[PDB]
Amino acid sequence: GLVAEAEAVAAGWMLDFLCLSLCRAFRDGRSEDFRRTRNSAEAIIHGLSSLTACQLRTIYICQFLTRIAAGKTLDAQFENDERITPLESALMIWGSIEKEHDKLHEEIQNLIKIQAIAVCMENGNFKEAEEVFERIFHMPFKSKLLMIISQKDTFHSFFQHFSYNHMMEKIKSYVNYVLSEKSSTFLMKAAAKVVE
């Protein structure tokens, strides 16, 4: 009874801490730390039986970042549907996150949409790029994107400007909000006190 209850409470604190740690590794480009932290968060999640809404949000953030991190990974599958790309999955989770639908949200959402198509066109998969587009779609540059696919214009001024790094930098900005938003969660706060 009471021991299992303490364990669930502790598991919630570990989830928050591991999210924070995942966010930092993502922000800093520390790829190996990200991998190991992802593995830990997954196990801690896999270990919980029930979830609060607030915990589900934390999990979404983790899922979002892992999908984005796997953006260029050719063999990476995140859905039942084997053809759904990581950036689509990221987009799916991005819509599911309870948050502000503001300036930065749309910029990120649109950059992800653009890059979901762009990765294929640097991979020669003009075929799938359209299927990606099909699955994805209502944005400002919608029309131009569809025709860039048709023209197979991989090196267009468009993809150069709305690049993978542009996408990563906008996402990293959001991550910084998440960082300071839950840097005061229990485990990190206790740990910071000890150290300070």
């Binding site: 899922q63 599958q77 995140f78």
Partner: peptide
Amino acid sequence: ILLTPR
């Protein structure tokens, strides 16, 4: 599937 890809 959850955090790690297949």
